[PDB]
Symmetry: C3
Subunit: 450 residues, 3 copies
């Protein structure tokens, strides 16, 4: 009989906490916003047991999976309301020919540079290397951004050719991935060469890249609206514009439409519908959240009209224009996971651009029972070994125990006219009651081939 | 040169032990019947190594898999003998266009109620809730049955729509499952609501549900022929009739034809053929087993004629009539496993009806090497941790040992004119020979990514 | 700026070490040959990280996989050079319609017998049993060979029908395997019957079978050119001829074209091209390696002309003629692995010919997330158990520690006018600083279902 919302801790939550009050005293219903880590992973797990938030906030790309796993309820926006929001963002939230989430805003990474250290930014990726040179001599760097999430480097990977799944005739092809073609390699190798050439680090993430640009330690960065807020507060004269090109090709970023979905396990299913339909998705609702952390190109037509006239937003849309709309299909988590590994491995040097990118593709396929078996049998040789080790420790323990007991025996004899050892020290007596049941249980332990 | 049969401990084994004697002294060949737990799982494992019984008894549904795994021999019933048994039960035991087992009897769950506590039983599922109310007030309950095996609750899941695989044009479609559609959810949610509303328990199984109906603690129950025996012995006036309806739809139970198969690793392959063809599948053979535990609608035409005129049997057939014939395809074990998990999870509340039922479906598909890899790598982070723990224990052990040795040192000095410690206590000396080889082996331990 | 080659330790490496010198002083570039165990497995792993050899030597069958994993560079043999080598061996090294390795020689197992113990060899498999009888009476055996690698017994498995993948219309069909058909079983059962009948052992490998034939302990053996060298040195009058027939059918051996590939991670990519194109693949290059360990039917036309006139080579080609060319497709490692398991299991009796051969086939398919899950959950019940065991050991350790400390306490009291225990023994004091951090870490340990 309440209402709980979940949003990314990197978005305008306190701003949503406000619209969360408008609902409370104007409806009485207590709204509560939460922002946990690994949100996209947590929800599906807690939601699966009937727990979790009534409303979930995340990009549309991973909703199809939550829907496939049957975790949310189909929303029912009255044919009228559907015309308050842009049609293209409605599709982004329509899975299996049905609506599964309320689009909130359109996001697209952009190129943020500090006009005070770089009045004129680079129009090409190819020149950042030599540009970083000049700045490194001055103490700072040229470009810094999160290298932990494929989301950021992907725009470069797609630039010269890379692509998730081919959208063949209004239908994405799962057997048609393109994470390991020419364009792909090209992009990744360049990015890596950047780290290889000390222009970039790899242990670098979000808080690391964010704190650096904001401290003026770097001239460039790649992010989305939500960031702008913290830069303003940092009094650094920044500028938002189109992303650099690669091999003459514009960086193709993956665009996502942040959405609000309704936990199928939710009892307050209408409370939500009305909170989003009549409280959030309003010009004054989108605004409160925006004052907290820029949403970008909101879906509400009325609000986008006086938001689109802003350069930071115009550039975000040009970027999304240059990019592609993320797919819905449940095969995203995999895809994304595949690319996270490639990028991290290739960058960390644990893999090669050619090797990493290949794995990504080939691995998107089914593993034989054989491997599962081999895997199985393998872990056995393993577990078994831990056992004997454990088992052995027990015995030795015992050998030590008896040894101790014996010594203690001689003591009691020395302190006999005292009452043995414990009585002569006038202290609580100790006791070697030693027993390890699991020791045996682990020996019986049937084979894992069952 | 002998002969061994395996049957479920819940069926008429001692009755088969008798026909097992008719074979012995009338052929000399010693027959032996066994009934182990997890029979359907055990056989494939022991049979795989050439061990196990010459003859196996279980429902036809899982024989295709034993045949696929190449565990049984094709039977050779002479075109004449095939007309002693009902044609429809012959199909149930024909895989890949070949015969793999001898059908014994047709089984179909029914509704058993105690006429003395409920003269008139419920014709609908929807009324058991309120009916359980009246009885709970009297001390007993309304319905109780095994909730550990999908077999029992399935009739409800299929009732309003659920289905294993769609039989498209004389061919079952593996890509066409129906464990997560409307009818499915409907049924499961109701069943769960029954437990949710304290009308039913979930930790409840066979022996629990069987002992309750037989003790008169409950008015209803769902089972098959084999059960009737123990009720008779319990002097409870029971009645067997059609299963209740759900949403106006009759509970569709999965019918199985208990069969006898021949271990391909069997040397006494003809001994079997003749034991089943000329000793078991005879009116007097089926009868002996029947006196032990009701087989149901046997396959032997002659015996079914004077068995079908029995209400308990008429109702069993009406039930099977209302239901569907179980598929042969090796993809049953999976399917069944999928539903066992759904039902147990949904009931125990560990999952939701919508979440559980979905898993069942989506999981019937292939997992990426990625997951296998992720899984792999994951278990590593794990195993490794156990190591260091183990490893650490060893060291501490040693620290303790030396500590002990030292103390012992001072003792020998106190009891020096005695011969040290051991000599003064005049007892076998203890010894700290401490060594854990596996400790190192576990350190070397290559990564699991190989 | 160097150059490293990897070849099997069972081939002519020192011979290649020589041609490795011709390159050095005639180019200055230092060449180094290595021969590690599990080469085919090692390379893909080290090559994946950018390490490993610039050139890899192994049969063509597993190159497609290295290419699929993107581990080698496409070679560029000038249209002219391609006519120095036999066209059929060029195909063997062409994957995805591109060249990935330089063919070196064509290999095909043969039948080696000691003319001095068996002037006339068996033309059929069926007679070795009774022939082994006569010889066993004389102290020796009839046939001995490596039973650890499917490569050797495969010629028998394919003889009467077995086959990897069906080559349908210039295209191998992955869904069309034939490791579990009639011919297959036939062959395997016979082979096994050979061991079952004490004519053959199963713990038998290469060094075991090689040392026996060379010591004159056996009259026959199955191997390839590389072997001949060691027999010559052993002064045993051997003979190389066609393989025995099975059920009237000639043993169909799998032929491989030993090839040299170029690590895609290689900086000396041209150094290689020139080492193989102008130094190795020359009549004098092939020769140096040949003096070390027979290559067989080399690919260099000029050298094959005066090599083919040799009986050992004529017979090798007749054998390959009777056999089939190994496929390129990455699905070989699996296939091979599948057959290694079948043969070892069937032979060791851990499985039956019918059961083992089936697994091989059915397992070449995808495993459900279910199994992965079941597997997962299963390992949990496992890991968890090891924990509590470990955990328990810790506690007991502690109980022992305190016990020890206490005893020590009484000692210090006995040796008080000495300075306690440590001071009376005038030795470094011991210390029970006991702490197992992982103990807790392992308790927190989230479930593996994440
Ligand atoms: O990097 C993989 C990740 O990419 C996208 O997530 C973005 C999200 O859309 C943005 O709104 C912002 O919060 O940052 C995320 C990356 O940190 C996908 O939407 C997401 O599913 C995927 O895992
Ligand atoms: O619950 C899954 C289970 O269902 C069927 O097994 C029945 C069997 O047919 C009956 O004869 C009786 O013994 O009880 C079983 C359930 O306990 C399937 O035949 C079986 O394969 C499946 O696992
Ligand atoms: O037994 C499986 C194994 O077979 C073939 O390997 C042969 C190789 O071709 C020969 O040149 C020689 O070295 O011995 C090997 C078997 O020990 C396949 O080429 C190989 O991939 C496969 O694993
Ligand atoms: Cl002690
Ligand atoms: Cl331990």
């Amino acid at each position: 009989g309440k209402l709980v919302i979940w949003i990314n801790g990197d978005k305008g939550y306190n701003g949503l906490a406000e619209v969360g009050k408008k609902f409370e005293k104007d409806t009485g219903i207590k709204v509560t916003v939460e922002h946990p880590d690994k949100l996209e992973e947590k929800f599906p797990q807690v939601a699966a047991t009937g727990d979790g938030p009534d409303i979930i906030f995340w990009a549309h790309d991973r909703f199809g999976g939550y829907a496939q796993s049957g975790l949310l309820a189909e929303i029912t926006p009255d044919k009228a309301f559907q015309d308050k929001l842009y049609p293209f963002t409605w599709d982004a939230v329509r899975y299996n020919g049905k609506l599964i989430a309320y689009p909130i805003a359109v996001e697209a990474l952009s190129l943020i540079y500090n006009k005070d250290l770089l009045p004129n930014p680079p129009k090409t990726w190819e020149e950042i290397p030599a540009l970083d040179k000049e700045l490194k001599a001055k103490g700072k760097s040229a470009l810094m951004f999160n290298l932990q999430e494929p989301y950021f480097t992907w725009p470069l990977i797609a630039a010269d050719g890379g692509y998730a799944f081919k959208y063949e005739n209004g239908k994405y092809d799962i057997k048609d991935v393109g994470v390991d073609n020419a364009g792909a390699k090209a992009g990744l190798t360049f990015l890596v060469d950047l780290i290889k050439n000390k222009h970039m680090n790899a242990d670098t993430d979000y808080s690391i890249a964010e704190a650096a640009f904001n401290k003026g330690e770097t001239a460039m960065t790649i992010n989305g609206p939500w960031a702008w807020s913290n830069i303003d507060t940092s009094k650094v004269n920044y500028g938002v514009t189109v992303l650099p090109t690669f091999k003459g090709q514009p960086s193709k970023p993956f665009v996502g439409v942040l959405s609000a979905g309704i936990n199928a396990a939710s009892p307050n299913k209408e409370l939500a519908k009305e909170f989003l339909e009549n409280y959030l998705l309003t010009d004054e609702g989108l605004e409160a959240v925006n004052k907290d952390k820029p949403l970008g190109a909101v879906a509400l037509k009325s609000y986008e009209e006086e938001l689109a006239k802003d350069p930071r937003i115009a550039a975000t849309m040009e970027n999304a224009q240059k990019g592609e709309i993320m797919p819905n299909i449940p095969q995203m988590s995999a895809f994304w996971y595949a690319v996270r590994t490639a990028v991290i491995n290739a960058a960390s040097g644990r893999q090669t651009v050619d090797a990493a990118l290949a794995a990504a593709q080939t691995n998107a396929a089914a593993m034989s029972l054989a491997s599962g078996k081999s895997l199985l049998h393998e872990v056995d040789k393993d577990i078994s070994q831990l056992t004997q080790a454990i088992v052995k420790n027990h015995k030795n323990l015992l050998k030590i125990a008896q040894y101790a007991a014996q010594n203690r025996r001689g003591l009691d004899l020395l302190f006999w006219e005292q009452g043995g050892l414990c009585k002569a020290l006038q202290e609580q007596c100790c006791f070697l009651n030693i027993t390890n049941s699991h020791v045996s249980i682990l020996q019986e332990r049937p084979p894992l081939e069952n």
